[PDB]
Design a protein around this ligand. Structure first.
Ligand SMILES: Cc1cc2nc3c(=O)[nH]c(=O)nc-3n(C[C@H](O)[C@H](O)[C@H](O)COP(=O)(O)O)c2cc1C
Ligand code: SF4
Ligand code: FES
Lengths: 87, 215, 429
């Protein structure tokens, strides 16, 4: 329930092949950027970095939870279905 | 431990165990349910469950399931109640369930002596039954008889301000088919002092006395 | 003004407290009950609250809350919801039997108080949640209620008032936590006796999700006698902020244990010696005393002499009045053992929905058994203090405070005993 990693914008590259190594069975790659991750404080900064370095980007807006009405009395009601049977 | 709070089916305690309410219990249940608003009938769980306990002596899983079916409640909402409250017996108990108080107001007044005298007279331990399936001894907390201590509760009756001799009498009587007189075994009848009435020995004033005027 | 000790029977409010007169309606009318209740009802509710206030009447449940203000949180306009009154009769607090005595020997007073408080609050019925071990008391109560319904004092036209009022009795199935305003309500509603939080407050949303006001047996049983004789009369007894005739229950290591009514702010030493026969061996053999119930800190002989048995004096004595159940110990007691048994009681009677009590009370019970044996080191007493303080004000209910307080008293007055036990255990190894 922590919300401290939902603050900074990230930049991640497309995933490419990973094939088992015959000798041991480990994961191999020919993708140097397989683990490239950059951290930005805003969306325009990331878009600018991408444009600058010549990359193509598809952006994804930020998902903020909607504010929610909450009441401890609703659990105890005379006529509504909020009445809970599990105290 | 002894109070496990789980239920593993057995031949004696299974859903198919033969429980059912009597036509009188059903009318008592109707009245009980009527003692609560029309939309809130899941509040009769405790009285109906204690009623089933009275009819059957104890509470098997089928009893709780039938209570639920009657009140149209989830059976888990009844399992929770049964497990939470201690008056509800989920294992068969003896003809005469003996609940000994061992909290300090009674302990101070030599309650362990009574607990031991019962351990011996009966041939059981602090939480066992008898082979005859007549007696069942347990330790419990304050029963609201702290002044008439020591004391024990036997199937909805109290026996107070007693001693090893008195409890021996009570047990010799319960083993002969008799039900003794609930109350202190000493001279006093209730919480009144033993020496003599020191608070209200006068007669009471009676109606209209002390009444303020303008009412 | 001073010397609030003695109290005459002309002013005693629970006359059949020892089962000397018939507890049925004949004795009730013959003793001053169900008299002028019609006029009490045709008087406004605001007048009843004015009386409850000018009487200084404070609740006896264990907390010192003034009723009049409590019962005035509920004197609002209705919002199309039935208002209720729930009487607390689940006296599981060790040392307390006053409510039992009332229930079984003068129940018509309780019923009349139900009716009066109901008209005061705007109620529609009175739910008397009574302990389940009190089957005979509840049966006497239902007998009285039947007598009252037959005589016409409660029901469709309660005494001829146009006010309709019912009285229901409810058994509890043996739980001490069901004595709280909220767990009481949950039990009635069918759920476990697990308290609920505040807010909401029972007056806003309570039993069946409706307005509610919980009250002790003694409070309601007194209310009509106050409204009838006068609050100022009730307020002439005791000190300014704490006033009234209070029931007392004197148990443990006392030769003549008993229940009694007296003037509040009475000297405890008098309360013991005059009514009881004093401690078994003599005042000198008095080790310590619990002024209220098990939920109250100990106090030793030193201060037990000049102490007045009321709320404020006991607070200033680092303790509290509670239900006024004087538990007496003499010098022949393993006081550590008594307090450990109290902690075991609180361990059994915990509901288990809020972490502090659930865990720390069993923690403290284990530590207390260890102290009884002496297997502990004297550096653990401050750990136990800190645990108590972590439990105290971090719970949903008071049972955590009640489990934390006797330990604080034990450590505040009997630390050397614990250290000596530890020293003996170290020598024995
Ligand atoms: C664990 C616990 C147990 C209680 N037991 C009782 C009880 O047995 N009787 C009682 O009158 N109040 C008891 N109370 C106090 C309740 O708050 C009670 O319903 C309320 O104080 C009664 O109102 P009054 O004191 O104004 O009369 C208990 C509180 C707690 C936390
Ligand atoms: S302090 Fe104990 S009894 Fe009170 S609500 Fe928390 S767990 Fe339940
Ligand atoms: S301590 Fe035993 S009845 Fe109260």
């Amino acid at each position: 329930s922590g919300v401290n990693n939902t603050k900074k914008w990230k930049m991640e590259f497309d995933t490419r092949e990973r094939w088992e190594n015959p000798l041991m069975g480990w994961a191999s790659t020919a993708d140097p950027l397989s683990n490239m991750v950059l951290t930005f404080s805003a969306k325009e900064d990331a878009i600018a970095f991408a444009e600058k370095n010549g990359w193509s980007y598809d952006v994804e807006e930020k998902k903020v939870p909607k504010p929610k009405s909450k009441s401890y009395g609703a659990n105890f009601s005379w006529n509504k279905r909020t009445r809970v049977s599990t105290k | 431990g002894g109070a496990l709070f789980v239920h593993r089916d057995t031949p004696e305690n299974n859903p198919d165990t033969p429980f059912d309410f009597t036509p009188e219990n059903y009318k008592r249940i109707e009245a009980i349910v009527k003692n609560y608003p029309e939309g809130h009938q899941a509040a009769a769980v405790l009285p109906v469950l204690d009623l089933a306990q009275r009819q059957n002596g104890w509470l098997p899983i089928s009893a709780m399931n039938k209570v639920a079916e009657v009140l149209q409640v989830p059976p888990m909402r009844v399992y929770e109640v049964a497990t939470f409250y201690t008056m509800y017996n989920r294992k068969p108990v003896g003809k005469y369930h003996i609940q000994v108080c061992t909290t300090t107001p009674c302990m101070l007044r030599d309650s362990d002596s009574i607990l031991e005298t019962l351990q011996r007279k009966l041939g059981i331990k602090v939480g066992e039954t008898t082979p005859d399936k007549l007696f069942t001894l347990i330790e419990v907390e304050c029963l609201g008889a702290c002044v008439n201590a020591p004391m024990v509760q036997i199937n909805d009756n109290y026996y107070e301000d007693l001693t090893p001799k008195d409890i021996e009498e009570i047990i010799d009587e319960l083993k002969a088919g008799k039900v003794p007189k609930p109350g202190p075994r000493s001279g006093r009848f209730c919480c009144e002092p033993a020496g003599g009435l020191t608070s209200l020995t006068e007669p009471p004033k009676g109606p209209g006395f002390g009444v303020q005027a303008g009412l | 003004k001073t010397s609030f000790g003695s109290l005459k029977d002309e002013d005693r409010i629970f006359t059949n407290l020892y089962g000397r007169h018939d507890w049925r309606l004949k004795g009730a009318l013959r003793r001053g009950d169900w008299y002028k209740t019609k006029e009490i009802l045709l008087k406004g509710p605001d007048w009843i609250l004015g009386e409850m206030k000018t009487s200084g009447l404070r609740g006896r449940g264990g907390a010192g809350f003034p009723t009049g203000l409590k019962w005035s949180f509920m004197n609002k306009p209705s919002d199309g919801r039935p208002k209720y009154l729930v009487v607390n009769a689940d006296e599981g607090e060790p040392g307390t039997c006053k409510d039992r005595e009332i229930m079984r020997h003068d129940p018509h007073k309780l019923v009349e108080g139900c009716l009066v408080g109901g008209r005061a609050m705007g109620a529609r019925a009175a739910y008397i949640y009574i302990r389940g071990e009190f089957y005979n008391e509840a049966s006497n109560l239902q007998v009285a209620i039947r007598e009252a319904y037959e005589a016409g004092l409660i029901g469709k036209n309660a005494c001829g008032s146009d006010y309709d009022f019912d009285v229901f009795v409810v058994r509890g199935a043996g739980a001490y936590i069901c004595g709280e305003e909220t767990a009481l309500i949950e039990s009635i509603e069918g759920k476990q006796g697990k308290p609920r939080l505040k807010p909401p407050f029972p007056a806003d949303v309570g039993v069946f999700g409706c307005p509610t006001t919980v009250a002790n047996v003694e409070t309601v049983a007194v209310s009509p006698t106050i409204c009838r004789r006068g609050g100022t009369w009730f307020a002439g007894f005791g000190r300014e902020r704490n006033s009234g005739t209070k029931l007392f229950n004197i148990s443990g290591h006392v030769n003549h244990p008993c229940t009694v009514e007296e003037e509040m702010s009475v000297p405890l030493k008098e309360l013991i010696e005059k009514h009881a026969g004093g401690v078994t061996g003599g005042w000198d053999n008095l080790l310590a005393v619990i002024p209220g119930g098990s939920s109250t800190p100990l106090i030793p002989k030193s201060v037990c002499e000049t102490v007045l048995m009321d709320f404020d004096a006991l607070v200033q004595a680092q303790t509290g009045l509670g239900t006024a159940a004087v538990i007496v110990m003499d010098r022949s007691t393993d006081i550590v053992k008594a307090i450990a048994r109290l902690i075991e009681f609180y361990k059994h009677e915990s509901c288990g929905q809020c972490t502090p009590c659930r865990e720390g009370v069993d923690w403290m019970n284990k530590v207390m058994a260890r102290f009884v044996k002496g297997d502990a080191r004297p550096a653990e007493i401050d750990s136990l203090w800190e645990i108590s303080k972590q439990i105290e004000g971090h719970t949903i209910c008071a049972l955590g405070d009640g489990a934390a307080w006797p330990v604080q008293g034990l450590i505040r007055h009997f630390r050397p005993e614990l250290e000596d036990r530890m020293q003996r255990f170290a020598q024995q190894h």
